[PDB]
Structure 1
Amino acid sequence: MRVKMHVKKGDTVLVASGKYKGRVGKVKEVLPKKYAVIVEGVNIVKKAVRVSPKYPQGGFIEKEAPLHASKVRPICPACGKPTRVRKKFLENGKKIRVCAKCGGALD
């Protein structure tokens, strides 16, 4: 089947565990195969790069490292709180994610 994952690309999340616990950012990318996400400005690693074209000075570059998807919590755009995700069926027949606290949509 499919990798059921509670967050999606483009939504704001809270890092609730680990070194960067308490930080807030936007999901850059989602890695269902690794069950991981990438959050802007979070979990920056230093990577050694060789001297070459497009890396003339070599040295080190900085990149975000993926986080396990259970460490992030989506933030409601209505009540502004981290929350669990509920399913709400719309009168037009579509299904959307809603915040488990106040019921607001999560897009």
Structure 2
Amino acid sequence: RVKMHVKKGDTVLVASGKYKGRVGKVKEVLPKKYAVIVEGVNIVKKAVRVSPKYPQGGFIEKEAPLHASKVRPICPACGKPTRVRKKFLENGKKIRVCAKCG
């Protein structure tokens, strides 16, 4: 069921695309669409809703999802692939240098 290699908390860097380079906290993960939303790829929605709440308002600037592959997690270094290590309970994501978050 959709493996997925980054979570809500994580601090990812956008490895490719237009926001190649940027670094951000993934706000939301969307396993169904295999995508995450970070702080890159944000766009300009025409906010019709002039009538309901959000009057006058012509537009909005929500942040669009990103193919989950477009991002990589980081820690005292750059991005890493992920290695999983077994303790004496269950496993945890350790980068290819140290470890990932408390």
State TM-score, norm by structure 1: 0.69
**Consecutive unaligned residues in structure 1, runs of 5 or more:** 103-107
String of CA shifts for 1:85-106, please: whole Å, max 9, x gaps: 767666899999985999xxxx
Q: Which runs of 4+ in 1 moved over 4 A?
A: 77-102
Cα pair distance change 1:89/1:81, threshold 3 Å: same
Once residues 43 and 70 of structure 1 are traced to their aligned partners in structure 2, the CA distance between those partners, rounded to angstroms, is 17
Q: CA deviation at 1:83?
A: 6.5
Q: Which has the higher strand share?
A: 1
Q: 1:25 to 1:91 in 2, by over 3 A?
A: closer
**1-structure distance, mates of 2:36, 2:26:** 7
RMSD of aligned residue pairs (Cα, Å): 4.3
Aligned-residue offset at 1:10: 1.1
Q: How many residues align?
A: 101
TM-score by length of 2: 0.72
Identical aligned pairs, as a percentage? 100
